[PDB]
Scaffold this active site. Structure first.
Site, mmCIF file in Angstrom:
data_model
loop_
_atom_site.group_PDB
_atom_site.id
_atom_site.type_symbol
_atom_site.label_atom_id
_atom_site.label_comp_id
_atom_site.label_asym_id
_atom_site.label_seq_id
_atom_site.Cartn_x
_atom_site.Cartn_y
_atom_site.Cartn_z
ATOM 1 C CG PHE A 1 -3.904 2.017 4.756
ATOM 2 C CD1 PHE A 1 -4.920 1.379 5.445
ATOM 3 C CD2 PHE A 1 -2.696 1.345 4.585
ATOM 4 C CE1 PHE A 1 -4.720 0.103 5.992
ATOM 5 C CE2 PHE A 1 -2.494 0.076 5.123
ATOM 6 C CZ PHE A 1 -3.510 -0.539 5.824
ATOM 7 C CD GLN B 1 -1.009 2.407 0.607
ATOM 8 O OE1 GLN B 1 -0.535 2.206 1.717
ATOM 9 N NE2 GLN B 1 -2.027 1.693 0.118
ATOM 10 C CG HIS C 1 -4.707 -11.234 1.793
ATOM 11 N ND1 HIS C 1 -5.421 -10.247 1.147
ATOM 12 C CD2 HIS C 1 -4.501 -10.785 3.053
ATOM 13 C CE1 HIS C 1 -5.644 -9.253 1.989
ATOM 14 N NE2 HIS C 1 -5.098 -9.556 3.149
HETATM 15 C C1 LIG Z 1 0.383 -2.044 1.697
HETATM 16 C C2 LIG Z 1 -0.901 -1.186 1.655
HETATM 17 O O1 LIG Z 1 -2.001 -1.918 2.247
HETATM 18 C C3 LIG Z 1 -3.237 -1.426 2.128
HETATM 19 O O2 LIG Z 1 -3.478 -0.369 1.548
HETATM 20 C C4 LIG Z 1 -4.340 -2.171 2.776
HETATM 21 C C5 LIG Z 1 -5.714 -1.673 2.964
HETATM 22 C C6 LIG Z 1 -6.343 -0.360 2.582
HETATM 23 N N1 LIG Z 1 -6.356 -2.591 3.550
HETATM 24 N N2 LIG Z 1 -5.572 -3.660 3.782
HETATM 25 C C7 LIG Z 1 -6.032 -4.775 4.405
HETATM 26 C C8 LIG Z 1 -6.986 -5.567 3.758
HETATM 27 C C9 LIG Z 1 -7.478 -6.711 4.391
HETATM 28 C C10 LIG Z 1 -7.027 -7.061 5.667
HETATM 29 C C11 LIG Z 1 -6.072 -6.276 6.337
HETATM 30 N N3 LIG Z 1 -5.640 -6.623 7.586
HETATM 31 O O3 LIG Z 1 -6.313 -7.411 8.224
HETATM 32 O O4 LIG Z 1 -4.725 -5.997 8.082
HETATM 33 C C12 LIG Z 1 -5.587 -5.122 5.685
HETATM 34 C C13 LIG Z 1 -4.361 -3.413 3.320
HETATM 35 C C14 LIG Z 1 -3.214 -4.403 3.405
HETATM 36 MG MG LIG Z 2 -6.830 -11.455 7.177
HETATM 37 ZN ZN LIG Z 3 -3.234 -10.545 6.996
#
Ligand SMILES: CCOC(=O)c1c(C)nn(-c2cccc([N+](=O)[O-])c2)c1C
Ligand SMILES: [Mg+2]
Ligand SMILES: [Zn+2]
Length: 326
Positions: A287, A284, A75
């Site tokens: 997800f 993944q 982030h």
């Molecule tokens: C690249 C892989 O990303 C992830 O696995 C992943 C997961 C699970 N949650 N998040 C995530 C966490 C906070 C916020 C957000 N978002 O708001 O999209 C996504 C990500 C990026």
């Molecule tokens: Mg966010």
């Molecule tokens: Zn974001």
């Protein structure tokens, strides 16, 4: 200069899904958000349309970028630049041709740029569970998202940073409202409701003979913009594998650092945050199956068939990650 020349060449792919964003971050001296935002504003003629002084735009962008944490693995300013550029590509979808006004385009791009600013590298739930000052300020709801908005808007008041100085009062009010509506929608706790409403829009979808979406009222227009930026936020698994794998490495590093804080505090370790009991590849696939694919398949239906290549890449990446599981 060679570095400057190669950066310019990489930025020629600004309208393409799969931009080499990490390379751009390196070549720009860790200024991907500033250079990508500036490039996009020039490409869309936003400086001329909204009479934004070039020096004001760069000053604000550099200030905004400085408020992303360089020690947060996911982030950070690279993620912000990536979401900005991804939104920029989604706005160019043939099915959305001439659908949104220049002010709405500006709002979506600005929202994308500020959407995670000053992110501390821990989740809303962690902030709530640790009785943090942020959760106290925001009464446990959309804690981070409210903060990102507050910081993004407050920075406009710094010296030579008001990029909206030449917008009318009405335009400023409209843009502010749209930006708030968009960033608050990036709160993951709202994902299921956002998706449910997107599915409903797809069922009652109205289009021209060329397949362009017909959105009249604010409710429908902002809903599409909210889902667009949410898709951009959740676009990592739809990018070329080389990029996706880097994003996965980064979120896992961030998650593991949160789990380290939880473990020492005697708190239960959050899902995917325990470095000693992780299953990165299985996580993944999960997800993608439960969050990313359901969202992108619905977006693909809305703009059919414009998102087919994105969906194809997502499915290729899911297949590859699954193959790494014995
Ligand atoms: C690249 C892989 O990303 C992830 O696995 C992943 C997961 C699970 N949650 N998040 C995530 C966490 C906070 C916020 C957000 N978002 O708001 O999209 C996504 C990500 C990026
Ligand atoms: Mg966010
Ligand atoms: Zn974001």
């Amino acid at each position: 200069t060679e570095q400057e020349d190669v950066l310019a060449k990489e930025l020629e792919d600004v309208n393409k899904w799969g931009l080499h964003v990490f390379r751009i971050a390196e070549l720009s001296g860790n200024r991907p958000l500033t250079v990508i935002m500036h490039t996009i504003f020039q490409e869309r003629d936003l400086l001329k349309t909204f009479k934004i002084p070039v020096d004001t735009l760069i000053t604000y962008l550099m200030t905004l970028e400085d408020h992303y944490h360089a020690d947060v693995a996911y982030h950070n300013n690279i993620h912000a630049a990536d979401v900005v550029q991804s939104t920029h590509v989604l706005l160019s979808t043939p099915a959305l041709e001439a659908v949104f006004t220049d002010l709405e385009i500006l709002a979506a791009i600005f929202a994308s740029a500020i959407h995670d600013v000053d992110h501390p590298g821990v989740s809303n739930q962690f902030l709530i569970n640790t009785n943090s000052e942020l959760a106290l300020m925001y009464n446990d709801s959309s804690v981070l998202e409210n903060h990102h908005l507050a910081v993004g808007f407050k920075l406009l008041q710094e010296e030579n940073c008001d990029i909206f100085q030449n917008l009318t009062k009405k335009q400023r009010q409209s843009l502010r409202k749209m930006v708030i509506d968009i960033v608050l929608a990036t709160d993951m706790s709202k994902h299921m409701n956002l998706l449910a409403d997107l599915k409903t829009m797809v069922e009652t979808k109205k289009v021209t003979s060329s397949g362009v979406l017909l959105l009249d009222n604010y409710s429908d227009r902002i809903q599409v913009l909210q889902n667009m930026v949410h898709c951009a936020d959740l676009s990592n698994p739809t990018k070329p594998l080389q990029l996706y794998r880097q994003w996965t490495d980064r979120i896992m590093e961030e998650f593991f650092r949160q789990g380290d804080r939880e473990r020492e505090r005697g708190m239960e370790i959050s899902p995917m945050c325990d470095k000693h009991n992780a299953s990165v590849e299985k996580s993944q696939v999960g997800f993608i199956d439960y969050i990313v694919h359901p969202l992108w398949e619905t977006w693909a239906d809305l703009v059919h068939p414009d998102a087919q290549d994105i969906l194809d890449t997502l499915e290729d990446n899911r297949e590859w990650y699954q193959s790494t599981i014995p």
